[PDB]
């Protein structure tokens, strides 16, 4: 059983998005499907659900104007439009296998729709340079979300953390740091590898003893 | 609107023994001898994931130690025994009457044995510092409990105005929380100063643990 929803977007406020949602594994004829809102760190709010050998629908007051719930039999799929997009909609929306009586058994991956002014901005990287020993890296001013971190290629895992980033001022920062023993720094190399896909930017940053 | 209240909002519990989280639906959700009671587990950055159907029917996949309990506007989860993978939000839901609705959840977390953190600071790189702008970066490092509150001081005066804080959700290794303090300043601000310290106040310690540098 699967459910794979389409990517994620960033819009503008006053846009819609079509969210769709690809099924298979059960017969889709016979099934509920239901769209989810949950925000970062929030519980889950129903929006809609359709019954997809009738297409009928029944939507959450909360939302009723905002979304439209349909279903290509033909193909498994499910869709939702969700329209007059604030800020105030950026979430993750989920589509799941259930309604009605039914408990919701199969989840979809999940789609973050970012509704937001503010333009696309390339992340400003940070060397923090200081047994062990702990490294760092301050990845600042960015927009959107997601940036990546990793250390020496992602081959460096043991004793990282990264750390969620914080929205500050309409642009993001995020930080990482990585202990090593201080036998292995900096007699080898400790590097911040540091990705943003919606700049297309990467970029590297050896850290070296102040 | 159905109104869900689950209990508590957070609970710690060791290896091996009892979770129990329960919901106080405001009104019946039972129709035709059947409590439409869910609950569900979610794990960071994943969807939620179906544990209990039915007010105590298994998902599919879900072992015993899940177990559901409850009638008419009273229910119960109970994990037993728990184990290293279980800490996750956990959520009741009901499906008895539209709008289906979710109670706000409860954070289930391992409790393991206290942990001081590691403190770290780092002054402003010297690259940052061609932008006109400075961070002081504090990063704690593998603690337990999660409550701990960090303040900075310049010149040993407290400083509140531009600090920002970020926490990692409990490592599914060790158990341990981890915790990232910056302090941001103009450049010329920085420079007219010299000693930065980054203060914690952790159970570990009835003193606050200090790290600091002088920008000497």
């Known amino acids: 059983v699967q459910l794979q929803q389409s990517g994620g977007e960033l819009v503008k406020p006053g846009a819609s998005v079509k969210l769709s949602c690809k099924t298979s594994?059960?017969?889709?004829?016979?099934?509920?499907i239901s769209w989810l809102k949950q925000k970062p760190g929030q519980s889950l709010e129903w929006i809609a659900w359709?019954?997809?050998?009738?297409?009928?629908?029944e939507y959450n007051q909360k939302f009723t104007g905002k979304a439209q719930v349909t279903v290509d039999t033909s193909s498994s799929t499910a869709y939702m439009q969700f329209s007059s997009l604030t800020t105030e909609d950026s979430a993750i929306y989920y589509c799941?296998?259930?309604?009605?009586?039914?408990?919701?058994?199969?989840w979809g991956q999940g789609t973050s729709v970012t509704v937001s002014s503010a333009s696309t901005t390339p992340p400003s990287v940070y060397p923090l340079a200081p047994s062990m020993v702990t490294l760092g890296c301050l990845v600042k001013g960015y927009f959107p979300e997601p940036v990546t971190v990793t250390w020496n290629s992602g081959s460096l895992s043991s004793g990282v953390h990264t750390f969620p980033a914080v929205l500050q001022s309409d642009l993001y920062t995020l930080s990482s740091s990585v202990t090593v023993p201080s036998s292995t720094w900096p007699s080898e190399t400790v590097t911040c590898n540091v990705a943003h896909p919606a700049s297309s930017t990467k970029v590297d940053k050896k850290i070296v003893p102040r | 609107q159905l109104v869900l209240t689950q209990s508590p909002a957070s609970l710690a519990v060791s290896l091996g023994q009892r979770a129990t989280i329960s919901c106080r639906a405001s009104?019946?959700?039972?129709?035709?001898?059947?409590?439409?009671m869910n609950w569900f587990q979610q794990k960071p950055g994943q969807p939620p994931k179906l544990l209990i159907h039915?007010?105590?029917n298994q998902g599919s996949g879900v072992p015993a130690r899940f177990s559901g309990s409850g009638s008419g506007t009273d229910f119960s989860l109970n994990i037993h025994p728990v184990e290293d993978d279980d800490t996750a939000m956990y959520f009741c839901?009901?499906?008895?009457?539209?709008?289906?609705?979710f109670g706000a959840g409860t954070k289930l977390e391992i409790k393991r044995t206290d942990a001081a953190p590691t403190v770290s600071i780092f002054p402003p790189s010297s690259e940052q510092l061609t932008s006109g702008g400075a961070s002081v970066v504090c990063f704690l490092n593998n603690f337990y409990p999660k409550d701990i509150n960090v303040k900075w001081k310049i010149d040993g005066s407290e400083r509140q105005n531009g600090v920002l804080n970020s926490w990692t959700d409990q490592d599914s290794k060790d158990s341990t929380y981890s915790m990232s303090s910056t302090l941001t300043l103009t450049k010329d601000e920085y420079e007219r100063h010299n000693s930065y310290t980054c203060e914690a106040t952790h159970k570990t310690s009835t003193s606050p643990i200090v790290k600091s540098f002088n920008r000497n």
């Open positions: 799941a296998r259930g309604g009605s009586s039914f408990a919701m058994d199969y």
């Open positions: 594994g059960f017969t889709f004829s016979s099934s509920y």
């Open positions: 359709i019954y997809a050998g009738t297409g009928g629908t």
């Open positions: 009104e019946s959700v039972d129709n035709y001898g059947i409590s439409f």
């Open positions: 039915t007010a105590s």
């Open positions: 839901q009901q499906s008895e009457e539209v709008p289906l609705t």
